[PDB]
Amino acid sequence: EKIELSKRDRLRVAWRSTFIQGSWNYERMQNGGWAFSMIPAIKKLYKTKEDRSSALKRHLEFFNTHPYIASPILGVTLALEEERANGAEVDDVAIQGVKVGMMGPLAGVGDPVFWFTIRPMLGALGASLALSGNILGPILFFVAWNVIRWGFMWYTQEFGYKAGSKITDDLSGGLLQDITKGASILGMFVLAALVQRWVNIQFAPIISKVKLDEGAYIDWSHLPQGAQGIKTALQQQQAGLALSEIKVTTLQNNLDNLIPGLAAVALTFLCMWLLKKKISPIIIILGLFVVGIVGHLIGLL
Amino acid sequence: KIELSKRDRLRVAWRSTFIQGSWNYERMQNGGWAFSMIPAIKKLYKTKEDRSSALKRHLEFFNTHPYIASPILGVTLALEEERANGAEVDDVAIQGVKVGMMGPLAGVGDPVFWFTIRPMLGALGASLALSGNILGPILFFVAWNVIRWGFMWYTQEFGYKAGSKITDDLSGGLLQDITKGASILGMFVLAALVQRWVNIQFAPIISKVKLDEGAYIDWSHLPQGAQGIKTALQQQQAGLALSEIKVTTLQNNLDNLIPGLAAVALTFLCMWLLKKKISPIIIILGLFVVGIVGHLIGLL
Amino acid sequence: AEKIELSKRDRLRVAWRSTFIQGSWNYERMQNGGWAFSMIPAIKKLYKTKEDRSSALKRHLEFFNTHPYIASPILGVTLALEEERANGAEVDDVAIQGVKVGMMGPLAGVGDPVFWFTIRPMLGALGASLALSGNILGPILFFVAWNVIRWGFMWYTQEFGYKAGSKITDDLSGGLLQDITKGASILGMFVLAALVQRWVNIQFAPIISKVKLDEGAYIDWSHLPQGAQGIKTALQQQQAGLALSEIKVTTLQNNLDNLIPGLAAVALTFLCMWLLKKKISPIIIILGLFVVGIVGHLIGLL
Amino acid sequence: EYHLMNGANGYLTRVNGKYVYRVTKDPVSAVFGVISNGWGSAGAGFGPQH
Amino acid sequence: MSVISIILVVLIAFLAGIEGILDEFQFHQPLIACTLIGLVTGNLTACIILGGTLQMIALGWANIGAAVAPDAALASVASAIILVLGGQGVAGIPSAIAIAIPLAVAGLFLTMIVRTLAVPIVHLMDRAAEKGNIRSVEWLHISAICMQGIRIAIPAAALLFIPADSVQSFLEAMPAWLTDGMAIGGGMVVAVGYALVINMMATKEVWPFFVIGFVVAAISQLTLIAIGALGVALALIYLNLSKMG
Amino acid sequence: MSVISIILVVLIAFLAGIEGILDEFQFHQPLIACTLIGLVTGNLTACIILGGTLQMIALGWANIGAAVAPDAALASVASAIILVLGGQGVAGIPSAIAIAIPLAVAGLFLTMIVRTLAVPIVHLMDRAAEKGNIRSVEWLHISAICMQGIRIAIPAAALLFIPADSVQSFLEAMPAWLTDGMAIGGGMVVAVGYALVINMMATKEVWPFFVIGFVVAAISQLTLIAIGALGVALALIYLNLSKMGG
Amino acid sequence: MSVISIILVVLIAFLAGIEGILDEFQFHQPLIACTLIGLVTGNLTACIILGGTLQMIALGWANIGAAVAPDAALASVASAIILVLGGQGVAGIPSAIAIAIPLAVAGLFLTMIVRTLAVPIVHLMDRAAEKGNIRSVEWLHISAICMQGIRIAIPAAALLFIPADSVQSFLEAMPAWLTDGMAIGGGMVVAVGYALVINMMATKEVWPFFVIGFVVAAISQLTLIAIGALGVALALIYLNLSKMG
Numbered sequence A: 001e002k003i004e005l006s007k008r009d010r011l012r013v014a015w016r017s018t019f020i021q022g023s024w025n026y027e028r029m030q031n032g033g034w035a036f037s038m039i040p041a042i043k044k045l046y047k048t049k050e051d052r053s054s055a056l057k058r059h060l061e062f063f064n065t066h067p068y069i070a071s072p073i074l075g076v077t078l079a080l081e082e083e084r085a086n087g088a089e090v091d092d093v094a095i096q097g098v099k100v101g102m103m104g105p106l107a108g109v110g111d112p113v114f115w116f117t118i119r120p121m122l123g124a125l126g127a128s129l130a131l132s133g134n135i136l137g138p139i140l141f142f143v144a145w146n147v148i149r150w151g152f153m154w155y156t157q158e159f160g161y162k163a164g165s166k167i168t169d170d171l172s173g174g175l176l177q178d179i180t181k182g183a184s185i186l187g188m189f190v191l192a193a194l195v196q197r198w199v200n201i202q203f204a205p206i207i208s209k210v211k212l213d214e215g216a217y218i219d220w221s222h223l224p225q226g227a228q229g230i231k232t233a234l235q236q237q238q239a240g241l242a243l244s245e246i247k248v249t250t251l252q253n254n255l256d257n258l259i260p261g262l263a264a265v266a267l268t269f270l271c272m273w274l275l276k277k278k279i280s281p282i283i284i285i286l287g288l289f290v291v292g293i294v295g296h297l298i299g300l301l
Numbered sequence B: 001k002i003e004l005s006k007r008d009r010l011r012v013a014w015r016s017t018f019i020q021g022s023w024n025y026e027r028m029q030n031g032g033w034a035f036s037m038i039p040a041i042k043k044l045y046k047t048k049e050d051r052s053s054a055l056k057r058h059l060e061f062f063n064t065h066p067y068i069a070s071p072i073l074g075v076t077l078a079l080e081e082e083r084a085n086g087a088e089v090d091d092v093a094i095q096g097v098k099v100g101m102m103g104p105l106a107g108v109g110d111p112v113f114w115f116t117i118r119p120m121l122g123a124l125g126a127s128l129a130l131s132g133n134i135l136g137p138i139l140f141f142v143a144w145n146v147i148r149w150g151f152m153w154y155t156q157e158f159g160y161k162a163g164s165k166i167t168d169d170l171s172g173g174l175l176q177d178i179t180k181g182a183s184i185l186g187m188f189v190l191a192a193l194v195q196r197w198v199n200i201q202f203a204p205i206i207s208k209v210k211l212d213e214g215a216y217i218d219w220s221h222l223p224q225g226a227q228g229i230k231t232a233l234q235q236q237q238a239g240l241a242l243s244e245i246k247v248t249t250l251q252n253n254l255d256n257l258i259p260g261l262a263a264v265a266l267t268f269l270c271m272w273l274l275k276k277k278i279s280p281i282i283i284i285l286g287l288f289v290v291g292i293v294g295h296l297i298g299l300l
Numbered sequence C: 001a002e003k004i005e006l007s008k009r010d011r012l013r014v015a016w017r018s019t020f021i022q023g024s025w026n027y028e029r030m031q032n033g034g035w036a037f038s039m040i041p042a043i044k045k046l047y048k049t050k051e052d053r054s055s056a057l058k059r060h061l062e063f064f065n066t067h068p069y070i071a072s073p074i075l076g077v078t079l080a081l082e083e084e085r086a087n088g089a090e091v092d093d094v095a096i097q098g099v100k101v102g103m104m105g106p107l108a109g110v111g112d113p114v115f116w117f118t119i120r121p122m123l124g125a126l127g128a129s130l131a132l133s134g135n136i137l138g139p140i141l142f143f144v145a146w147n148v149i150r151w152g153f154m155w156y157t158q159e160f161g162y163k164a165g166s167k168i169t170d171d172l173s174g175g176l177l178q179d180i181t182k183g184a185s186i187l188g189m190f191v192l193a194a195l196v197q198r199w200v201n202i203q204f205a206p207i208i209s210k211v212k213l214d215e216g217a218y219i220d221w222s223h224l225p226q227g228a229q230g231i232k233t234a235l236q237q238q239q240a241g242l243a244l245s246e247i248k249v250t251t252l253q254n255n256l257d258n259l260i261p262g263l264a265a266v267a268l269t270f271l272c273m274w275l276l277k278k279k280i281s282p283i284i285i286i287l288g289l290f291v292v293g294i295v296g297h298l299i300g301l302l
Numbered sequence D: 001e002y003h004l005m006n007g008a009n010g011y012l013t014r015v016n017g018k019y020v021y022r023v024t025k026d027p028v029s030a031v032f033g034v035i036s037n038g039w040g041s042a043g044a045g046f047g048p049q050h
Numbered sequence E, G: 001m002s003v004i005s006i007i008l009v010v011l012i013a014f015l016a017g018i019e020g021i022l023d024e025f026q027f028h029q030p031l032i033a034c035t036l037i038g039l040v041t042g043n044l045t046a047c048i049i050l051g052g053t054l055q056m057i058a059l060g061w062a063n064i065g066a067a068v069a070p071d072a073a074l075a076s077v078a079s080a081i082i083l084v085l086g087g088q089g090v091a092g093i094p095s096a097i098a099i100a101i102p103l104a105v106a107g108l109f110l111t112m113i114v115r116t117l118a119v120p121i122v123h124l125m126d127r128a129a130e131k132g133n134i135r136s137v138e139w140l141h142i143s144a145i146c147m148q149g150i151r152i153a154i155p156a157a158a159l160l161f162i163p164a165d166s167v168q169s170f171l172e173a174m175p176a177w178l179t180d181g182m183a184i185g186g187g188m189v190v191a192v193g194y195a196l197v198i199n200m201m202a203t204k205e206v207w208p209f210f211v212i213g214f215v216v217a218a219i220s221q222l223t224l225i226a227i228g229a230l231g232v233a234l235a236l237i238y239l240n241l242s243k244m245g
Numbered sequence F: 001m002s003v004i005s006i007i008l009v010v011l012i013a014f015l016a017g018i019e020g021i022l023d024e025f026q027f028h029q030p031l032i033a034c035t036l037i038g039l040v041t042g043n044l045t046a047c048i049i050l051g052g053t054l055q056m057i058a059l060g061w062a063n064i065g066a067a068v069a070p071d072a073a074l075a076s077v078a079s080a081i082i083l084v085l086g087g088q089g090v091a092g093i094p095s096a097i098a099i100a101i102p103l104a105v106a107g108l109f110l111t112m113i114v115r116t117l118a119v120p121i122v123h124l125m126d127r128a129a130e131k132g133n134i135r136s137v138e139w140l141h142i143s144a145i146c147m148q149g150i151r152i153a154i155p156a157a158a159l160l161f162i163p164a165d166s167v168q169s170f171l172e173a174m175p176a177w178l179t180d181g182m183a184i185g186g187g188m189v190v191a192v193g194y195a196l197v198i199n200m201m202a203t204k205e206v207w208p209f210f211v212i213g214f215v216v217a218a219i220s221q222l223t224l225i226a227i228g229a230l231g232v233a234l235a236l237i238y239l240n241l242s243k244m245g246g
C-alpha cells in the first residue's frame, strides 16, 4: 500500500530524464520531456486510469530549466507525489509551487557552469589534441562530459528525492547561495569575455583619407635599389614610418581607440533591454538578421 | 650564573653565517648548527662531561632557510641559558622548538628571500650593469648584505629576549599575517616563474598544408622596383601568409589552450612525486633522463 | 513674516553672481572670492545690523574648489541651510562645511569630463566646421548653444538644490559619504598610476653599446636572392628573429624598460611629491622641470 | 626630431628654424581623441581637492 | 562512396540531429560528429583536425531559453561530408570551414521551424493525456525526437547524393546582397543568448566582475582557458573574503 | 589701423582676458576671440578660418584642478592681431598658427604669475571682512577680475604699437637647442600636476591600488577608458567586501 | 695575464665556490663574480654587462631543500674567464652566455658529488663530538667549506691554463643525443625546486593566487618586477580586506 518508488523506477526516471528535450516547443517549453520522464512514476503510483489523466495534465504545463540541473526538481517532485499517493495529501499546487521555485535559480546556476564554463574548457582541451591529429581529444571530451553529466544527474536526483520537503531548508541560504554567488561571478566574467570576443559588429565606413607630410611615408620612389632597398624599407617601417602616403582612418579604429568591443557590448545591452520588455527572442534574432542585411545594404556594416 | 653577554651572542650570530657548507644529504645543515652553537656550548658547559652530550643534541637533523634561522638559534640559546642555571634538563624541549619552527619558518623565508627580495635586487642591479655602471653590482651586494645581516641580528635578539615564550608568539598574530601574505606573494611569484623559467618546448610537426590561392603573397605576380616591396608589406600587414605552405607545430597547438601548460603539468607531477617521499636527486636525474629520451624520440 | 524667506529675485542674483565664481583664483585657497561673491546677496538679505556678517563671511571664505558650472547645487543647498539656520539652530558651522567638502570632490570629478571634455570639443568642432568655410554661423551657434546649455544647467541645478536643501544633507550624513570618499580615492589612485606611467614622457638618449652581432644572427643582405624571392627570404628571416643590421645598438632606455616601463616617470613624480610636501611652490617645480629638461638635453642625457 | 607640442589635431615642430604646424588628424578623429583622453583621465578626479 | 559508408553517414547525421535538441551526449558537437563521419568513410585524421578547428570556432554556441544558437549540428556534419567528398583531406579544411560558417541559414531557421512545428505535437499529447492513454504521449515524444533528428539527416543525404548537380543554391541563393548581409547577421545572433543568460544572473554585487572580464579580454594575448581560470580564481577569492565576516 | 579700431581691439582683448579665467561665456575661445577681432578691425571673413583652425587645435585645453592649460586667450588675440597687421588675410593663417602654438612660453607662465599673486588679494579680503564690510569684498573680487583681464589687455595693445614681425623673428631666433629643452621639459609638468593630487589623497590602504594601476599600464594593449573601468570595478568590489566584512 | 691576475682570479673563483653553498654574501651570483673577475683582469666594463645579462638569465635559480638549482657559481666564473681570455670584450657576450648555460652538466652534478661526499665529514664530526673534541668539529666544518670552494676553484684554474687537447673532447661528447639532450633537460630542473617550495606553502586560500599569477604571465608585456609588485599589492589588499572582516 506504500508503493515506495523502488530504486529501479528511480533509475528508469533518471534514464528517461536524458530526453527532457526533444518535444521542445515555444508555448510550453520542455514540458513533454517532463511528462515523458514522469511517465514511469505515473504508471507505478497511479492505476485504473481514474487519475492518470489528472497526473499527466498536471505535469504537462510550463517547465523551463537547464537539462542537467533538473534532477533535483525531478526527485523533489517524485518524493512529493509518492508522499501524496499514500496519505491523502492532494495539493496540485505544492508540486507546482516547488517547480516554479526551482525553475529560475537552478537554470541560472546551471547555464553558465555547464554551457559556458565546463563545455568551453572541455572543447578546447579536446580540440588541442584533435588539432594535432590525436583521436584522444574527442574521446576524452566525450567520456569526461558524459561521465560528469550522468554523475551530476544521478547524484542530484537521489539527493532531491532524499530531501523531499527539506530541499528548501537544507539548501536555502548555505551552500546554495554560495554556489549561486560563485557561479554568478564566474558566469559574468566568462560571459563578458565571450561578448567581447564572439560578437563581431565590425563597421566599415571610411572616416577620412589624409595626406602625410614628407616625414612619414616610406617614399618608395627614392629608395635604394636592390637588396639595400628591402633593408631600408624594413628598418624604416620598424622605426614607425607610415607604409603609405595616405593615412586612411575608419570608424572601427576610432571606436577601438575608446575601448575594443564597444559595439558588441552596446548590442548586448540593447538585447537585454528588449528582453526585459517581454519580447520573445525569436523576434530579436530575426531583427538581428534584418539589421545585418540592412547595415550591409547601406554600407554601415 | 651564566650571563651570555652580548659579545657571545654576536659571536654566535657571526658563526651562524656558516650554517651551510657542511651540507649533506643524510642530515642537511646539521653541522652548521653545531658550528654556530660551539661558542655558546663552550661558555655554558665545562669539564667536558656534558660537552659531548651538548654536541650530540645539536648534531641531529636541522634544515631551514639559512637567513631565517636566527630566531631558532636565539630561542635555543635562551633555553640553554635557562637550563644551565637551576638544572632544568629537558632534552626534549630543545628538540620540540627546533622542529616546531623549522617548517613554517622555512616556508616563510624561501619566498621572501630567494624568490622575492633576491630577484628584485638582481633585476635592479642588472638594469644598471647592462649599461656598464659599477653601481649595479655594488648596490646589489650592499643592499643584500645589509638586509641579511640586519635581519639575522634582529631575529637573533628577538629569539633570545622572548625565549620559551616564543611558543605564544608562534601562535600569532603577526606570525599568521606574515605567513599568509608571504604565502600569497610566493604563490604569485612561483606561478610566474613556472610559466616563464621552465622550457619544455616541443618540436614535432603536425602537418604541412598547401594554402589556398588567396592566402600567400604569390611572389610571382608581384611588382618590381620598390613597388613589389610595398605590395608585399601591405599584403603581410593585411594578414596574408608569407609562404604558401602552412606549418603547424604541436607547441603551437598546445599554446592555443594556455602557454606553459607543459611546465605547470610537469611541476604538478613533481609536487605529487615529492609528496610520495621521493628524494629530489632522483627526480632531477630522472628529469635529465626524460629530456634525453624525448630528444631521441623527437618529442623534444 | 520673521522667517526672512529668499525670494526668486535673491536666488536669481545669486545665480547671476555665480558666473564670477572664478576671477580671484588663488593657489593657497582656490575659488574663495567667487563663493563670497555669490553669497553676498544672501548674507545681505538674511543677515542685518552687521553684528556677525564677519562670521558669515569667514564661514564662506574658506577653501572651495569644484567645476565652475556644476557648483549651483552646492549653492542651493547652502542657501537652504543658511535660511534654515537663520531661525532653527541646526548648522553650528560644522554641517555646511561638511556638506561643502563632501560635494566638492565628486561633483568636480563628474563635471570635468562632461563639460570640458565632452560638450566643449563637440561644440568646438561643430563651430569650426562652419568657420573653416568663412561662415560666422559657426561661431555664433557655438556661443549661443554653449551659453544656453551652461545657464540652463546652472539655474536648473540651483533651483533643484534649493528645494532639495536640508533633504540632500541627510543622505550624505549616512554611509554614503565615507563610501564615496573611499571609492573615489581607490579609483583616483588606480587611474593616476596609469596617467603617470603613460602621459609622463621621459626618454633617455645615451647609447651604451654598438656591438657587431655574431654571424647567423642577422640578415646578410649580400647573399639575398636577386629580387622576387629576396623579399620572401628577408621577411621569413625577420619573422624568425634575425636582426636587420650587423651592428646591434643598446640604449639606457632599453635597460630601464627591461627593468619596468615608466620607472623614471614614477621616480620624478615621487620627487615632486616630496618637494611639494616640503612646502615648495608648484611654480618653482614647473620652472625647475623646464630647467632640468634644458640641461639634460644640453648634456646629452635627454 | 622633436615634437615641441601637440594639439587636438597634429603637432608643432621647427623645420630649418621656421615653425611649422602639421595636422595629422581629421576633425572627428581629433574629437574622438579628445573625448578618449578626457574620459580616460576622469577617474583621477573625484578626490578630496585639499 | 560505398553503400555501407553512405548508410553510416546518414545514421551519424540522424544522431547529430537528435543530440542537437537533446544536448546530452554532445553527438552534435563538431569534435564528435566530424570525427565519426571521418572514421566511417576513410579519412579520419583529416576530419579530426577539421573537427578541432570547428570546435575552436563553435565555443560559446549554446541555446539559452528560446534563444537558439547558430549551427549546432548541421555545420559540423555538412563540413565533414563536403571535406570527404571533395578530396583535399587536410588542405581543404579552410574551404570546408568557410562553407560551414554561413550555413547558419540552413541551421538556425531549420531548427526554429521544427521547434515551432512541435506545438501541435504537444497539443496532441495533451489530448491523449486527457483520455488517460499514456502509451501515446511517449510515442509523440519519440516522434518529435525523430523529426528533430530527421531535420539534419535529410540534408546530409541530399549532400551525399549530389556532387555538384545543378548549382542554383550556389548561384541565385547568394544575390551578393543577401548572403553577405546574412553572414554578418549570423555573427551577432549569439548576443541574444548572452543577453538572456546575463539577465538570468545579474546583481549589483557581480556587475564589476562583468566589467573586469570585458576589460581583461583585450586583443589576442590571453586565451579563453586563461580567462576562465582567472574567473574561477576571482570567484574563489571573493567567496573566501566574503566568508570572513 | 584707425584709432577706434584700436580701442575696440583693446576692449576685446580685455574681455578675452577676463573670460580666460572666468570660463563661462567662452570669450577667450579662439572661435569667438578671432571672429570679434576680425570683425572690429575690418577684414572679418579672413579671420574666421583662423579661429576655426585655432579652435581645431585648441580642443581639450581646459584647466583641471590647479593644472593650468596653455594659451587659452593670449594665443587667439595675438594671432588675430598678427594676421591683421601683416596683410595676407587668407595666406598668413599658417604663419599665425605657427606663432600661436609656441605662445605657451608667453601665456601659461603669464597667467600663472597673476594666478599666484592673487593670494594677497584674498588675504586683504579676509582682513577687510574681519570687520564685516561687504563693499570691500565686492570691490576686491572685481579688481582681481580686471587685473587678470589686464594680463591679456597689455600684450595685445603692445602688439599694435610694434613691428608686425618682431614676435615671429624672436621666436625663430632661439638657439634651436632651447626649443628641444623646452619640449622635453614640458612633457613632465604633468608629473607635478599628478603629484599634487596624489599628495591630496594617499593612504596605507590605497597605495596597493596605485601599484596595480601602474603595473597594468603595459605598452599598448589596454586603453585609458578600459583602465578607468577596471579601477571603478575594483573600487566597487573593494567597497562591497569591506561592507560585507564589517 | 700576469701571475698576480691568475692568483686573483683563482682566489675569487674559490670565494665564489664557497659562497655557492654558503649562499650568504652572494659572491657566487654573476652580478658580483663576473665584475670581480673583470676588475682584476683589466677589462671591467666588458664584464659588468656580461654579469648583468647572466644575472637576468640566472634569476629564480635558488636551492630549495635538497633540490639544487643549476649552475650556481661555475656558470658566471667560467663565462667571465672565457670572455676575458678570448678577446671580443663586449662583442663576445652571446658566445660567453652560450658556453656558460650548458655548464649544467659541469655545474649541477659536481655540487651533488660534493654534497654526498660531505656525509663522511659529518660522520667524523659526530665521532669527534663523542670524545668531546670541540676543535675537531670546527676543523671538519672548515674543511668541508674549503672543499666546496675548491670544487669551483679547480675548473677555473684548468680554464686559465687551457689544455688545448680539450678540443679533442669538446666534440667527442656524442652530439645531439647527449649534449642537446642534457641542454634541454637542464631547462626544467628548476621545476623540482619550484614544486618543493610550492609544497611548502599550499592552502585552500592561496591556490587562486597561483592561478592568477600563472595566467597573467603571458608572452612579454609584464616584466618580472611588475609581476612581483602586482603580487605584493594583491597580498596587501587581501590582508587588509581580511582584517576588515
Ligand SMILES: OC[C@H]1O[C@H](O)[C@@H](O)[C@@H](O)[C@@H]1O
Residues within 6 Å of the ligand: A029, A030, A064, A065, A066, A067, A107, A108, A111, E023, E062, E063, E064, E065, E066, E067
Ligand atoms: O536555461 C534555460 C534552458 O532553456 C532550454 O531548455 C534550453 O535552451 C536550455 O539549453 C536552457 O539552459
Ligand SMILES: OC[C@H]1O[C@H](O)[C@@H](O)[C@@H](O)[C@@H]1O
Residues within 6 Å of the ligand: C031, C065, C066, C067, C068, C108, C109, C112, F062, F063, F064, F065, F066, F067
Ligand atoms: O576640476 C576642478 C576645477 O578647478 C578649477 O576651478 C578650474 O580649473 C576648473 O576648470 C576645474 O574643473
Ligand SMILES: OC[C@H]1O[C@H](O)[C@@H](O)[C@@H](O)[C@@H]1O
Residues within 6 Å of the ligand: B028, B029, B063, B064, B065, B066, B106, B107, B110, G023, G062, G063, G064, G065, G066
Ligand atoms: O628551504 C629549505 C632550505 O634547504 C637548504 O638549507 C637550502 O637549499 C636553503 O636555500 C633552503 O631554503
